[PDB]
Amino acid sequence: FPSIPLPINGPITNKERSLAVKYINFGKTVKDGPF
Amino acid sequence: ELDIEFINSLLTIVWRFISENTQEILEFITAAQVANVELTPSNIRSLCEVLVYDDKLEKVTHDCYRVTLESILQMIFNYFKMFPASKHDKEVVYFDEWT
Amino acid sequence: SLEQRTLNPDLFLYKELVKAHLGERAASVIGMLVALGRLSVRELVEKIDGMDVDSVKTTLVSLTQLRCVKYLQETAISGKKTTYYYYNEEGIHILLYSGLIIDEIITQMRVNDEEEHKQLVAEIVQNVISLGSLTVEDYLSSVTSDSMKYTISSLFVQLCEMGYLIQISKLHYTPIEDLWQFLYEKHYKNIPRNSPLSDLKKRSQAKMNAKTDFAKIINKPNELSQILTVDPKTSLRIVKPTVSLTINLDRFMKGRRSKQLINLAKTRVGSVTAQVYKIALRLTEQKSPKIRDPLTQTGLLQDLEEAKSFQDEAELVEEKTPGLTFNAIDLARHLPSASLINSHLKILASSNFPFLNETKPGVYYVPYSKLMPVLKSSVYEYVIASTLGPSAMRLSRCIRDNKLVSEKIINSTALMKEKDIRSTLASLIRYNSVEIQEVPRTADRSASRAVFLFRCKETHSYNFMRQNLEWNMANLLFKKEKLKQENSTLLKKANRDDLLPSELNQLKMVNERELNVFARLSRLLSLWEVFQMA
């Protein structure tokens, strides 16, 4: 419904695809840990 | 000079002249049988400031002119080859709708 | 989603970070301190409701360990000792930059290749600060008794002496202003009565003593002379095992600043000199001028005779620092040809962008104080050309150099038609790159009998950008947690096993789309962090 997107709309590259796996296990240590 | 368009036809030729690398411009515009009737140093300085605002060239030493290598972008700061999906994608980022 | 787009400052960013990956009970209390400023426990429980007084302290120790708040103790003459609790703004930035540190260890420690601590050195950052604080005895007492621990224990003095592993103390856990008061009162009680001459200068006599004390006490944790133990047996050098240490953001943010600068070079030069510039940029990273400027945070920044002194000495420090002025001779041995070291550096001074532009002849160094303002002016004008029309890129530069532009000279300086600029200028008042100046030619400032003048106003344009991006960060973070709410009964089944053949499809399409969220956020967060160089 709103126009004018930001120009950062790209398929994820393997240079940062492993970088995104480092987030999902990071909170898994914290939430499934003590707190 | 003239209020109707086709200034950009004059604009695109001089950008090619500096890319290979203000007095030099006057004879180059007089060549190539361009459709102009009145050349003057004032208009060439006026024509050049738009390319400064478009960053197509660089102004150095108050009279020399270099290129900012926009031609390699003309061919993150990489605004082409960035296609948005925009179809069936709800998690897209928009610049409006916060004002 | 008009509910969300309206009522949200940076508090909607700060509340959701601990709502993302932590227990729920701490997202309520972190919103209270940001909204109210500062408060102790004795008035905290009156503000919240649903948390017991010790259950506050049970909750408060969670973000205490993760260094997400910062305390202050002040006692009264009549009353007891009162522990005022503030918020930590950089300890929560660790949770923001959490994955990016793992890609910083690899891209800066390139001496090793195909090592058997690749999985391990990616885990040490997940070990050092996901536990909160960290000491040496925590990881050696793990399930591996030795497993060549002495190789691993000697691996971290390589990883600590490069920086960003500064021993924590009260200085890291207390804020910047509540330290400065009682030390300035310490220097002020060092100067008693019986010096009545120039008493306005005698008030500043403690202040000159406070400036040398401030740079001294901030270097005490950065002082690397006591972070090491010279071991005569079974080793050569080792850090002290009784040191509690976490990460330091300072070298990372300077290191993140270093990656930002070279992206301008790849735009402003090709592939040769950008590779030449990349190596010499790395050598000055460990000792660089400070990005946050702790001198200028809170103090005598209101008066210009002091506000000038925060960059008069700081330029002289950056100019007369020995640990960055390279000779441009040692660069050839680091590249995997001193003429080409000089010839490919000659283009760096020739451009009008002041990096490697001013120097003493024979020595070369990159300036900082007159470079980062050009980078902020460069990217946002390109962002205007990126998300909207390039005619505004012409108009943004036209009003930039031409101070106080009129509506007649805008068609004399810039060359476009009349109808198109109305369709381009009017979106820039809405987004505050241009502003309005009015000249009252009639009485009582008549709106019709007045012409309107413009301005760039290089401060208000960037303040609107910051909160525009701080919301867009948390907007994508808002679409993270809500996707985890639905389809939660099989994500619970995806965490009880460590198999319906059609149910597995509804776990991958939700997982591929959230993979795009972290990538766009990494593209977004780099564009926002350019403008924290203040």
Side-chain angles (χ1 to χ4, degrees):
Chain A
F1 178 75
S3 65
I4 188 167
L6 270 300
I8 46 167
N9 289 315
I12 183 164
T13 310
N14 53 4
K15 294 184 287 185
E16 69 270 16
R17 184 175 293 171
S18 178
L19 190 276
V21 182
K22 265 56 179 291
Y23 290 95
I24 52 94
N25 55 4
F26 183 77
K28 187 183 287 185
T29 304
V30 177
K31 182 178 74 175
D32 295 331
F35 292 146
Chain B
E1 181 68 28
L2 201 280
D3 294 332
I4 313 299
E5 293 293 327
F6 293 160
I7 298 100
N8 55 4
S9 65
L10 274 299
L11 182 143
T12 182
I13 300 300
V14 67
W15 182 62
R16 301 291 178 89
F17 180 74
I18 309 298
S19 66
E20 54 88 20
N21 206 168
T22 187
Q23 297 300 109
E24 182 68 28
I25 307 299
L26 291 170
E27 295 86 4
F28 181 74
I29 301 300
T30 310
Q33 62 183 357
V34 73
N36 291 113
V37 298
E38 179 67 29
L39 294 178
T40 184
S42 179
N43 206 165
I44 301 299
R45 293 189 297 271
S46 298
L47 194 277
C48 187
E49 295 294 327
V50 178
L51 285 307
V52 179
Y53 292 157
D54 294 332
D55 289 335
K56 307 298 292 296
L57 59 86
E58 191 268 334
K59 184 187 287 288
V60 65
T61 67
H62 187 273
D63 281 325
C64 182
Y65 295 108
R66 302 296 302 274
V67 180
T68 61
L69 59 155
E70 189 66 27
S71 64
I72 52 94
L73 194 147
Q74 190 268 330
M75 66 89 207
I76 42 94
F77 291 162
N78 47 5
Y79 295 151
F80 67 101
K81 78 266 191 185
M82 290 295 174
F83 60 96
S86 178
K87 293 182 262 74
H88 301 285
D89 192 0
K90 297 177 183 178
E91 288 82 2
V92 292
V93 185
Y94 288 156
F95 188 74
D96 57 358
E97 54 82 27
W98 185 63
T99 62
Chain C
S1 65
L2 194 144
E3 175 66 29
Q4 291 81 13
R5 76 182 75 259
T6 54
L7 83 175
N8 291 323
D10 53 356
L11 188 273
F12 179 69
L13 183 65
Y14 290 160
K15 184 175 74 69
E16 200 176 4
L17 294 175
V18 294
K19 188 177 179 180
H21 48 85
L22 204 144
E24 183 66 28
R25 64 191 184 275
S28 65
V29 65
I30 194 64
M32 191 62 70
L33 274 76
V34 177
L36 270 296
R38 63 105 176 86
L39 51 90
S40 69
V41 179
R42 298 291 187 268
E43 63 270 14
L44 195 150
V45 189
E46 284 79 0
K47 299 296 182 182
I48 63 169
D49 195 1
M51 294 171 68
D52 197 0
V53 178
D54 190 75
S55 178
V56 167
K57 290 176 69 176
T58 304
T59 304
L60 194 145
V61 74
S62 298
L63 40 85
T64 298
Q65 184 62 256
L66 296 175
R67 201 179 66 192
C68 294
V69 292
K70 287 187 285 183
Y71 76 100
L72 187 275
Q73 184 268 328
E74 182 67 28
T75 186
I77 299 169
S78 65
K80 296 297 294 295
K81 296 182 181 181
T82 303
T83 63
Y84 283 162
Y85 290 162
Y86 300 174
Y87 63 94
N88 193 1
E89 66 182 2
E90 58 91 20
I92 63 170
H93 290 169
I94 306 299
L95 304 177
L96 179 62
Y97 292 94
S98 65
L100 295 173
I101 305 298
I102 311 297
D103 203 3
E104 191 69 27
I105 306 299
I106 305 300
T107 57
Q108 295 298 321
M109 185 177 284
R110 295 296 94 194
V111 179
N112 299 115
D113 194 0
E114 294 293 328
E115 63 266 16
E116 294 296 325
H117 66 275
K118 176 68 73 177
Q119 184 59 255
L120 181 61
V121 78
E123 192 271 332
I124 297 304
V125 175
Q126 193 178 3
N127 197 2
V128 67
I129 205 160
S130 298
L131 279 75
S133 179
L134 192 275
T135 188
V136 179
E137 292 85 3
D138 290 332
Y139 64 93
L140 55 86
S141 177
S142 65
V143 69
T144 61
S145 67
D146 180 72
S147 179
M148 286 73 73
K149 61 98 177 179
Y150 60 92
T151 65
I152 304 301
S153 178
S154 64
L155 191 149
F156 299 118
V157 67
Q158 180 183 1
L159 190 272
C160 179
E161 295 294 328
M162 65 180 289
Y164 64 92
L165 276 78
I166 284 91
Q167 176 174 2
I168 54 96
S169 66
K170 60 99 176 179
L171 190 69
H172 294 283
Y173 204 71
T174 55
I176 193 167
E177 181 61 28
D178 56 354
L179 64 89
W180 181 66
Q181 294 295 320
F182 67 94
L183 62 86
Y184 178 73
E185 295 296 325
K186 184 173 74 174
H187 291 291
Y188 184 74
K189 298 287 102 176
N190 287 320
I191 43 171
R193 193 61 67 86
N194 301 114
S195 180
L197 54 92
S198 295
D199 289 331
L200 272 299
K201 283 90 172 65
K202 302 299 179 183
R203 298 293 184 271
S204 69
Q205 186 65 41
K207 185 176 71 179
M208 274 65 255
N209 293 318
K211 289 180 173 65
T212 62
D213 197 2
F214 185 77
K216 180 257 287 180
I217 198 66
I218 198 167
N219 200 2
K220 290 289 182 66
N222 201 3
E223 184 177 1
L224 71 158
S225 67
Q226 58 91 31
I227 63 169
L228 49 88
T229 298
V230 178
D231 194 1
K233 79 278 193 185
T234 201
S235 180
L236 58 93
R237 294 291 292 271
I238 196 66
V239 295
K240 185 178 289 293
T242 61
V243 168
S244 296
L245 76 161
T246 67
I247 199 168
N248 194 2
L249 187 147
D250 296 332
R251 192 262 185 272
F252 173 71
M253 189 59 72
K254 293 185 288 183
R256 187 62 179 169
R257 188 266 307 276
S258 69
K259 182 63 183 294
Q260 187 65 42
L261 294 175
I262 63 170
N263 199 2
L264 180 61
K266 190 182 286 184
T267 307
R268 294 282 81 80
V269 80
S271 179
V272 177
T273 309
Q275 183 63 39
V276 172
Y277 182 72
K278 191 267 300 297
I279 302 299
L281 181 272
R282 181 178 291 113
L283 294 175
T284 63
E285 289 178 353
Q286 292 184 359
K287 200 266 186 295
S288 297
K290 186 67 175 68
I291 183 168
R292 185 67 270 172
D293 295 331
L295 293 168
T296 64
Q297 296 295 321
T298 303
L300 280 77
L301 193 59
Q302 60 184 357
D303 50 351
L304 79 162
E305 70 272 14
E306 180 64 32
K308 287 180 182 179
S309 297
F310 289 104
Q311 71 269 12
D312 291 331
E313 292 181 354
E315 181 67 29
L316 191 146
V317 170
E318 193 271 328
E319 184 179 2
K320 298 284 101 177
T321 297
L324 86 165
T325 57
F326 57 91
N327 54 4
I329 301 169
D330 297 330
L331 304 179
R333 64 175 294 275
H334 294 89
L335 180 63
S337 297
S339 66
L340 276 74
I341 302 300
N342 197 2
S343 297
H344 294 286
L345 191 146
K346 184 260 289 181
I347 197 168
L348 277 74
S350 69
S351 296
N352 55 1
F353 294 97
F355 59 96
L356 274 305
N357 197 0
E358 57 90 20
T359 187
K360 190 263 184 295
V363 72
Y364 291 100
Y365 64 95
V366 51
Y368 290 95
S369 178
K370 291 176 70 176
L371 181 61
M372 59 184 75
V374 184
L375 184 64
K376 290 168 93 287
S377 297
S378 176
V379 52
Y380 164 60
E381 292 171 351
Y382 288 161
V383 173
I384 295 168
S386 74
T387 186
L388 69 154
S391 296
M393 178 61 201
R394 184 179 297 172
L395 292 174
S396 65
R397 294 293 300 272
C398 185
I399 304 169
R400 178 65 181 86
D401 58 350
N402 192 0
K403 273 74 65 180
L404 207 277
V405 64
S406 70
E407 195 177 2
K408 183 179 285 187
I409 196 170
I410 195 69
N411 295 112
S412 177
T413 305
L415 271 302
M416 288 181 285
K417 69 178 73 174
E418 191 67 30
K419 67 179 291 295
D420 290 338
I421 55 95
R422 272 91 166 92
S423 178
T424 305
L425 176 62
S427 179
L428 299 175
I429 294 98
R430 291 178 65 251
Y431 293 156
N432 284 319
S433 66
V434 299
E435 289 85 5
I436 307 300
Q437 181 56 254
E438 187 269 333
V439 283
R441 64 184 179 179
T442 56
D444 203 1
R445 280 78 179 269
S446 297
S448 178
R449 294 289 92 192
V451 297
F452 299 101
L453 282 306
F454 294 154
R455 190 176 294 112
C456 66
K457 193 61 180 291
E458 200 71 22
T459 303
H460 290 282
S461 177
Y462 294 90
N463 295 318
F464 176 74
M465 291 168 61
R466 184 176 294 169
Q467 294 175 354
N468 205 167
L469 298 175
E470 287 170 350
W471 178 69
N472 286 315
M473 290 190 282
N475 195 2
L476 271 295
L477 291 175
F478 184 74
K479 295 183 287 292
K480 178 181 183 293
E481 57 89 19
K482 62 98 176 179
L483 185 58
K484 294 176 72 173
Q485 298 299 319
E486 61 265 9
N487 296 115
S488 297
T489 183
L490 74 157
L491 267 294
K492 180 67 175 67
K493 190 175 75 174
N495 291 318
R496 72 176 66 251
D497 189 74
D498 292 330
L499 294 174
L500 200 150
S502 295
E503 190 178 2
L504 192 274
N505 290 318
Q506 292 85 18
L507 192 146
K508 292 176 71 174
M509 276 83 83
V510 298
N511 208 165
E512 57 88 20
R513 190 261 305 279
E514 66 183 0
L515 186 63
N516 205 168
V517 175
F518 295 100
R520 293 175 184 175
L521 188 273
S522 64
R523 293 180 180 178
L524 200 150
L525 182 58
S526 179
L527 297 173
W528 177 70
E529 68 188 2
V530 183
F531 303 101
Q532 294 294 319
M533 288 68 160

PDB file of all heavy atoms in Angstrom, chain B residues 1-8, chain C residues 417:
ATOM      1  N   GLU B   1      20.674  27.670 -22.195  1.00  0.00           N
ATOM      2  CA  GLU B   1      20.330  28.904 -22.891  1.00  0.00           C
ATOM      3  C   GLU B   1      18.852  28.933 -23.265  1.00  0.00           C
ATOM      4  O   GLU B   1      18.066  29.672 -22.670  1.00  0.00           O
ATOM      5  CB  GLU B   1      21.192  29.069 -24.145  1.00  0.00           C
ATOM      6  CG  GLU B   1      20.922  30.346 -24.925  1.00  0.00           C
ATOM      7  CD  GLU B   1      21.353  31.594 -24.179  1.00  0.00           C
ATOM      8  OE1 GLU B   1      22.290  31.506 -23.357  1.00  0.00           O
ATOM      9  OE2 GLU B   1      20.755  32.665 -24.418  1.00  0.00           O
ATOM     10  N   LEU B   2      18.481  28.125 -24.254  1.00  0.00           N
ATOM     11  CA  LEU B   2      17.100  28.073 -24.711  1.00  0.00           C
ATOM     12  C   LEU B   2      16.268  27.226 -23.753  1.00  0.00           C
ATOM     13  O   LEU B   2      16.718  26.183 -23.270  1.00  0.00           O
ATOM     14  CB  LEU B   2      17.040  27.508 -26.132  1.00  0.00           C
ATOM     15  CG  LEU B   2      15.819  27.790 -27.016  1.00  0.00           C
ATOM     16  CD1 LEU B   2      14.652  26.876 -26.697  1.00  0.00           C
ATOM     17  CD2 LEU B   2      15.402  29.250 -26.898  1.00  0.00           C
ATOM     18  N   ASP B   3      15.045  27.687 -23.478  1.00  0.00           N
ATOM     19  CA  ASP B   3      14.257  27.125 -22.386  1.00  0.00           C
ATOM     20  C   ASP B   3      13.717  25.733 -22.695  1.00  0.00           C
ATOM     21  O   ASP B   3      13.397  24.988 -21.763  1.00  0.00           O
ATOM     22  CB  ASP B   3      13.098  28.063 -22.042  1.00  0.00           C
ATOM     23  CG  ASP B   3      13.570  29.390 -21.479  1.00  0.00           C
ATOM     24  OD1 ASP B   3      14.662  29.427 -20.875  1.00  0.00           O
ATOM     25  OD2 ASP B   3      12.848  30.397 -21.643  1.00  0.00           O
ATOM     26  N   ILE B   4      13.609  25.365 -23.971  1.00  0.00           N
ATOM     27  CA  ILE B   4      13.188  24.023 -24.355  1.00  0.00           C
ATOM     28  C   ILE B   4      14.394  23.093 -24.252  1.00  0.00           C
ATOM     29  O   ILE B   4      15.535  23.553 -24.129  1.00  0.00           O
ATOM     30  CB  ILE B   4      12.576  24.027 -25.772  1.00  0.00           C
ATOM     31  CG1 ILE B   4      11.578  25.178 -25.906  1.00  0.00           C
ATOM     32  CG2 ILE B   4      11.841  22.727 -26.069  1.00  0.00           C
ATOM     33  CD1 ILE B   4      10.407  25.088 -24.950  1.00  0.00           C
ATOM     34  N   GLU B   5      14.151  21.783 -24.297  1.00  0.00           N
ATOM     35  CA  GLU B   5      15.132  20.784 -23.893  1.00  0.00           C
ATOM     36  C   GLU B   5      16.214  20.587 -24.949  1.00  0.00           C
ATOM     37  O   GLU B   5      16.411  21.449 -25.812  1.00  0.00           O
ATOM     38  CB  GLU B   5      14.442  19.452 -23.591  1.00  0.00           C
ATOM     39  CG  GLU B   5      13.535  19.486 -22.370  1.00  0.00           C
ATOM     40  CD  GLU B   5      14.304  19.689 -21.077  1.00  0.00           C
ATOM     41  OE1 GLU B   5      15.455  19.212 -20.987  1.00  0.00           O
ATOM     42  OE2 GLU B   5      13.756  20.322 -20.151  1.00  0.00           O
ATOM     43  N   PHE B   6      16.936  19.464 -24.848  1.00  0.00           N
ATOM     44  CA  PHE B   6      18.064  19.068 -25.697  1.00  0.00           C
ATOM     45  C   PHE B   6      19.359  19.747 -25.272  1.00  0.00           C
ATOM     46  O   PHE B   6      20.337  19.756 -26.027  1.00  0.00           O
ATOM     47  CB  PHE B   6      17.807  19.321 -27.189  1.00  0.00           C
ATOM     48  CG  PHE B   6      16.722  18.459 -27.772  1.00  0.00           C
ATOM     49  CD1 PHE B   6      16.084  18.824 -28.946  1.00  0.00           C
ATOM     50  CD2 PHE B   6      16.337  17.285 -27.144  1.00  0.00           C
ATOM     51  CE1 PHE B   6      15.084  18.034 -29.484  1.00  0.00           C
ATOM     52  CE2 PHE B   6      15.339  16.491 -27.677  1.00  0.00           C
ATOM     53  CZ  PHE B   6      14.712  16.866 -28.849  1.00  0.00           C
ATOM     54  N   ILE B   7      19.380  20.319 -24.067  1.00  0.00           N
ATOM     55  CA  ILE B   7      20.636  20.651 -23.403  1.00  0.00           C
ATOM     56  C   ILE B   7      21.405  19.383 -23.056  1.00  0.00           C
ATOM     57  O   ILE B   7      22.642  19.365 -23.091  1.00  0.00           O
ATOM     58  CB  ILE B   7      20.366  21.513 -22.154  1.00  0.00           C
ATOM     59  CG1 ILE B   7      19.704  22.836 -22.545  1.00  0.00           C
ATOM     60  CG2 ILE B   7      21.653  21.777 -21.385  1.00  0.00           C
ATOM     61  CD1 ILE B   7      18.204  22.856 -22.344  1.00  0.00           C
ATOM     62  N   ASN B   8      20.691  18.299 -22.739  1.00  0.00           N
ATOM     63  CA  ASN B   8      21.340  17.046 -22.370  1.00  0.00           C
ATOM     64  C   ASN B   8      22.111  16.432 -23.534  1.00  0.00           C
ATOM     65  O   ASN B   8      23.068  15.682 -23.308  1.00  0.00           O
ATOM     66  CB  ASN B   8      20.304  16.057 -21.836  1.00  0.00           C
ATOM     67  CG  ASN B   8      19.164  15.816 -22.811  1.00  0.00           C
ATOM     68  OD1 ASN B   8      19.171  16.321 -23.933  1.00  0.00           O
ATOM     69  ND2 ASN B   8      18.176  15.039 -22.382  1.00  0.00           N
TER      70      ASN B   8
ATOM     71  N   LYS C 417      13.296  21.991 -16.223  1.00  0.00           N
ATOM     72  CA  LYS C 417      12.068  22.711 -16.512  1.00  0.00           C
ATOM     73  C   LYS C 417      11.315  23.016 -15.218  1.00  0.00           C
ATOM     74  O   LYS C 417      11.676  22.561 -14.129  1.00  0.00           O
ATOM     75  CB  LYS C 417      11.187  21.914 -17.473  1.00  0.00           C
ATOM     76  CG  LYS C 417      10.598  20.647 -16.885  1.00  0.00           C
ATOM     77  CD  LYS C 417       9.695  19.947 -17.889  1.00  0.00           C
ATOM     78  CE  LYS C 417      10.504  19.278 -18.988  1.00  0.00           C
ATOM     79  NZ  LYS C 417       9.642  18.478 -19.901  1.00  0.00           N
TER      80      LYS C 417
END
